[PDB]
Ligand binder design. Sequence first.
Ligand SMILES: O=C(CC[C@@H](c1ccccc1)P(=O)(O)O)N(O)CCc1ccccc1
Ligand SMILES: O=C(CC[C@@H](c1ccccc1)P(=O)(O)O)N(O)CCc1ccccc1
Ligand SMILES: [Ca+2]
Ligand SMILES: [Ca+2]
Ligand SMILES: [Ca+2]
Ligand SMILES: [Mn+2]
Ligand SMILES: [Mn+2]
Lengths: 411, 411
Amino acid sequence: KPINVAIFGSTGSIGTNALNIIRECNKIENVFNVKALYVNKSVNELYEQAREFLPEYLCIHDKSVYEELKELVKNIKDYKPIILCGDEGMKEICSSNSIDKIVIGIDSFQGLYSTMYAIMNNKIVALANKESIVSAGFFLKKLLNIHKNAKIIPVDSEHSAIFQCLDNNKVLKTKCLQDNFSKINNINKIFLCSSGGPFQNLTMDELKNVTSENALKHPKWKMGKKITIDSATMMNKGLEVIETHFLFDVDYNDIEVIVHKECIIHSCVEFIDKSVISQMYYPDMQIPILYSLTWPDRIKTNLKPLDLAQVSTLTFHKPSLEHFPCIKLAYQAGIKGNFYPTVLNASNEIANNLFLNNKIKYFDISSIISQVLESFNSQKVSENSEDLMKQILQIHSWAKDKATDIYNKHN
Amino acid sequence: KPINVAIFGSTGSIGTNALNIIRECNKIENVFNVKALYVNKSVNELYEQAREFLPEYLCIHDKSVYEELKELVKNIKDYKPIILCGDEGMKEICSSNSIDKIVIGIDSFQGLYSTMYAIMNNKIVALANKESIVSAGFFLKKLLNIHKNAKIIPVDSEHSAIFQCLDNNKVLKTKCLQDNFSKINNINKIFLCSSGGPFQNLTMDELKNVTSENALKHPKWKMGKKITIDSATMMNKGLEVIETHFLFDVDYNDIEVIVHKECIIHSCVEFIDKSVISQMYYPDMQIPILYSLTWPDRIKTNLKPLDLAQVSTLTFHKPSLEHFPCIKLAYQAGIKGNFYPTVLNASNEIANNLFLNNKIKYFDISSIISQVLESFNSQKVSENSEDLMKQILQIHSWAKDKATDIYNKHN
Ligand SMILES: O=C(CC[C@@H](c1ccccc1)P(=O)(O)O)N(O)CCc1ccccc1
Ligand SMILES: O=C(CC[C@@H](c1ccccc1)P(=O)(O)O)N(O)CCc1ccccc1
Ligand SMILES: [Ca+2]
Ligand SMILES: [Ca+2]
Ligand SMILES: [Ca+2]
Ligand SMILES: [Mn+2]
Ligand SMILES: [Mn+2]
């Protein structure tokens, strides 16, 4: 009866929000069992979570703090968790019969491999790691085809919103990342809402001068550095366009980015009859996380009710692609298909980090990514699962090195 | 298999919008057969419709235009329809095996009676006559418990909006007008959007002297006189609050009226997790009517797509109960329960018509209704369906007489 959950990335933004809503839902009844907590290397933070939630499993990727973890946990009386490390620990958790649902709140390779193991073990995977979908979308679709009882449920707020706008009577007849998903759900088009980021109202002359300190400082909503920079360039939305494509089988010409600066409407679905359904709330990750764990039901929360009269005004406009060329790059990569999304994501990782570290300017971001995309030559897609995965990782590494080489030569 | 449809009140607003969307949808793919048309006495427009749609059945209320319809219909080549008359024609259409869905777009006794016959024959009934739900909701609920396979689908635009926000795998475990509909659908609260009407920004002193001409002239959206006056007083919205309560079993303290002057968001549903889902489009009756005929599926239309960036701004505010006291009266009658909603509806019918005819002032509308409500005493609710219907008719008639007497006494 309790939903048995593992959290990958339990000290990050998604992980901490997950545990916060789980704690609230478990006050009176045992709705969820927190069976496993995994982190990259935040050993002290994981220890503190273990004290509260007492999971059966604890895992740390970084083996150099494994011994520190085991020594910290000894101080917890009559608690005997299985303490694991590295990729073998990730696989053991994903394989456990005692786990039903896995929250993926970690990025990059750990996010990809944990998503893969969860699917291979026919789990429900609540995926907040958009980069895995963008970079490895065809690989995940292939895996989902083999492991027929696995399901990806989106946690990215916009994609959660879309998923919520659908009729569960039709959702239950397909699954995310399956061909024909949009046809079965009578989807015509998606409005993909965006905050627009901190630079939304700058002129082209002002935008030329922006620095990462301008994106990061005094933010309305405090988030990780990488995603803050992607929000400022709108590459975040560009990645979310490709994520939409893959999750919901929606054609690129039917995905429309809309800037909605109040961030109440989280996204909207237009059905084939031209009726539009939208999901709305305050900016929040707890509803998306909780819904991924309860779907297809909902459960009571004590979140503050939306007060629409107090919000009072909601606005919508189209983003300028001259100001936010990263959006255009993402559409171009998505439409080209093949491994261009892998290349996009990888080259962005480098450009984003160069800008974060004050090494390049705002329009150099899109210039580097564009040059790497132009340089990439299409490859035959491996039919075999493992070969395809290796192909993705090779192309990812190539794209990163190419971006770095471009920066090095114009430096 | 085609969808076989009957239209009651084919020459009215609901009726013509239904024929228009059916005609347009049919150009895309043949989904709908118009099997019966019924009108009150518009025999010339009925002839024109029968030429086009060639229904098996034609029926008119008024016997004294019966012969002329027979005669007009002779001119149509190859066409031998069953031509009927009055309440008996209505029963014959509703009991036909060749009819699956019935659109009720007529008011008053004819609306209540045709709804009743449609339910008694286990049909899907697409109901636009909100006054029958408000006045005779108890009777409808009882009938729907006796005829387990009958279903009412709402066509009133805000109620259609609500119904479209739901997951049909949950809706199919219940049906509208059933106790526990909101619990099964995990509904917490409803935002019932209003246009606010033509008097929305007037002062108390301006409202003291407004006339029916001020409500009716140069309307943003042209509708019948009665509903225009109801929109002006916001009694329309109060009736729609009671409608929401009956249709969806939502408590009155969980229904919030919000003035949304752009009329794009049609209403919103807050679930128990606090996630809010809304339906949006241009102001429109075609999507509500169409959804009632396709539910639980959707079909393709060639309606104009909503352009959110062009709409640009949506606004929301609370209505002033001091300016729109009819809203308060509707809540009070709803909360009191019993037959108070029947009394509200009947007395408003009189008060609306008095104001329309320049016999009373704006604040007299609420004053008359208030005084009628105050004079009513709660009645033992008959357990028997036939007695319950007679109680509703007698209370309706009493309430109209009472409103009339209050007018004549002060006058
Ligand atoms: O993709 C994102 C972050 C970037 C987008 C965003 C930024 C700011 C507000 C909302 C959305 P942007 O549209 O700028 O790319 N989210 O899904 C997280 C949304 C969220 C949730 C709780 C609190 C704050 C933010
Ligand atoms: O209840 C109503 C009419 C009164 C409400 C209304 C008035 C004006 C715009 C929208 C709604 P009000 O909120 O003033 O009571 N509808 O369901 C009709 C909606 C509609 C459809 C197509 C074209 C115009 C209007
Ligand atoms: Ca160490
Ligand atoms: Ca839904
Ligand atoms: Ca299309
Ligand atoms: Mn997002
Ligand atoms: Mn309405």
